[PDB]
């Protein structure tokens with residue numbers, strides 16, 4: 001079972017295809033490059049697509065905890081990472097998948113953004 005962690009280089013690939021597919025305006029893309037994600041439905045579906053191609057989010061189960069700690073805990077205790085992730089894992093009470101994935105991402109980065117940058121970083 002070969003698991004390929006998504007580095008920054010891989011991330012630039014997935015994110016590009018999601019951009020060209022979801023008709024994401026280049027202006028928004030500039031924001032994303034500076035790690036700026038506006039609270040808007042465009043950005044939300046963008047995050048969903050990216051997180052999906054990275055095999056990190058599913059439209060049914062939501063955030064894939066296993067892959068999440070395997071990815072994020074790049075250089076940190078996976079058990080603690082699992083915990084922090086779970087504190088951002090919720091149910092789709094909003095009933096929109098783009099916003100669901102976006103809420104998980106937004107929740108986590110607001111407390112642990114450095115880990116996100118490090119997870120995709122080749123140490």
Ligand SMILES: CCCCC/C=C\C/C=C\C/C=C\C/C=C\CCCC(=O)O
Nearest residue numbers: 015032050063085088089104105108116
């Ligand atoms: C339930 C909480 C889940 C939190 C998951 C958060 C991040 C997923 C883990 C690793 C992803 C690391 C970097 C990718 C982050 C945003 C997608 C690219 C956005 C962009 O390129 O502009």
